[PDB]
Each structure stands twice: as structure tokens, then as C-alpha cells.
Design a protein around this nucleic acid. Structure first.
Length: 218
RNA sequence: UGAGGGCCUUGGUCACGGCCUUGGCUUGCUACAAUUAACGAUCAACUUAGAACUGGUACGGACAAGGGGAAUCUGACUGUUAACGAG
């Protein structure tokens, strides 16, 4: 996991040339030309991360800030575990182990819960200091939380159907699908991104090029 | 002559540091030379296959198995006292 700064002046510069130019020990001509081919689009500013938090043993699928602390860094990876981080010390604080690879993580700070959607077609609820939502039919790719209601979260999955869930229940309330005449259910139909926008509703996008907007307002 | 970086700076903005704007090493497009680059640089490969010292050759000097020579009679028998026979 990388820890970066939005303001680029606070982060150390990285120079691709200096690796092959300052020592210049046994850099081959072909390697030099290959390096040169990577800066054909001008010389844009390049920066190095403020920190590199490294404890996961499998590809990390998502990372989020704490909705209150800004120092707690919950993240999920393909190594069935949820790790919380101390961004000040860049260290892993606590680890939780799930049975399946986790693909998305979302937070419900108003009731202190973490919803992790896994590759086992379900979303597990954890207390970062329980119940699990089921009903999907493929990988749960992304999650989002309702802005006005604190008990509702939306989930998009690789089966092409978004679903809205109440936390207290275990079944979806509404199952949004892709409204398109040219989409096939299992050929080109996936939801790679879902978003709860407080003004326009639910935005879903994926394998089908169309970006779909659904009301999702009372 | 356009682009991207670096040092400058000018105002408004949020408690030395952000946000929005103002004017002055790399590469892109064009114009005249060079096309003997038939040059130069760099990375990578490369170590000495030789062993053996056998004899028969022509020559120079002594041994080599061992008493010799001639002619007639005689036995199978050619082209000059023909030859031959361990007679």
C-alpha cells in the first residue's frame, strides 16, 4: 500500500536518468534506449511515495481512510484478511482473517461497522475495535453507502446486477439491473464501479460501455 | 518556431505552507549543410594440439652351415668341350 501526498512539493523527487547515468557501471546501449523510450512524452514531474505500508501477502484490492480519524487505514486484500494501519508509524495494527478473498471494503461510521464484499458472493460485516449479506451470484466488485440513510448500502457484482441492502436484514431490498437492449446477461455484463451520489442517485458502470443512473431516492 | 521541466515574480485567497491567475535541460514540427557512419562507443564471449624416440637403408671393414678341380663311361634328354644327376 502506498501513502502519498496531494501536494507534490512535500514528497521526494525520483529521477529515472540518475539510475543509469550517475553510476553508469554496465548499462547496455539497448537498456539505455529502452529507458529513453519511456520519456518520449516530455519530462513530467515524478515523485516517490511518502510511505510504503507492506504487510499483505496477496494483491490488495481496496484501501480507505477512517471517516473520522484520518489516521486509521483499513484495507482488504486477496489474502482473506482485513488489516488496519497506523499511518503515522506506517505499521499494521490489527488483522482479521476471513475465509475467502476480499474484493471491496466500505465503512459505516454512523454505526461503527465495516462491510467487506468478498469473492464468495457475499458481504461480511465486521466491528473494527457478525452478520453477512447474501444474494449475489458472482464477485462483489464494489460497495457504497447511502448518504442520507445510515442503514442502507449498495453493492455491485460481476453478475451485472446492483443490489441495495439494509444492514439489519439479510436479503436485498431492490435489485437494479442494466437497462440495455444490446447487453447479454453473461456475455458482456459486469459492474466494475458503483457510486452513491447524494444528488443524482446510483451510478453504475462496467463491462457494458453505458454508464447507468438510477433514482434510488425514496 | 511550438510543447514539457527548473530558477523568478505579480495580485486575490485560506493559519513559513496550500488554492486560482499574470509576464522570461528533454522533446516536437520546419529551413541550409553531411551522406566514404567505409566512423565511433558500449555490453557480452576467448585461451598455447601436440605426442612418441622405432627402425630398416645405401656405403666403408671381418664371420657366415663347408676340402676343391678337370675329363671320360653311364641314366632320363635342349637350342656348344650344351646343360642335368649330391650315378
Amino acid at each position: 500500500i502506498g501513502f502519498w501526498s496531494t501536494i507534490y512539493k512535500e514528497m521526494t523527487v525520483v529521477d529515472p536518468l540518475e539510475d543509469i547515468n550517475n553510476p553508469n557501471n554496465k548499462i547496455s546501449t539497448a537498456a539505455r534506449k529502452r529507458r529513453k523510450l519511456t520519456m518520449k512524452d516530455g519530462t513530467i514531474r515524478r515523485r516517490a511515495p511518502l510511505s510504503l505500508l507492506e504487510s499483505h501477502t496477496a494483491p490488495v484490492e481496496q484501501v480507505i481512510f477512517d471517516s473520522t480519524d484520518n489516521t486509521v487505514g483499513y484495507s482488504v486484500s486477496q489474502d482473506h484478511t482485513i488489516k488496519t494501519w497506523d499511518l503515522v508509524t506506517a505499521r499494521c495494527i490489527d488483522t482479521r482473517t476471513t475465509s475467502y478473498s476480499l474484493l471491496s471494503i466500505a465503512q459505516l461510521s454512523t454505526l461503527n461497522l465495516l462491510a467487506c464484499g468478498s469473492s464468495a458472493r457475499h458481504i461480511t460485516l465486521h466491528d473494527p475495535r457478525q452478520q453477512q449479506l447474501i444474494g449475489h451470484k458472482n464477485f462483489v466488485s464494489s460497495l457504497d453507502t447511502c448518504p442520507e440513510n445510515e442503514y442502507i448500502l449498495c453493492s455491485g457484482s460481476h453478475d451485472g446486477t446492483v443490489k441495495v441492502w439494509d444492514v439489519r436484514s439479510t436479503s436485498p431490498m431492490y435489485t437494479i439491473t442494466r437497462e440495455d437492449k444490446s447487453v447479454q446477461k453473461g456475455v458482456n455484463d459486469k459492474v466494475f464501479a458503483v457510486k452513491w451520489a447524494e444528488k443524482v442517485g446510483i451510478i453504475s458502470a462496467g463491462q457494458d460501455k453505458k454508464i447507468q443512473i438510477n433514482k434510488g431516492d425514496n
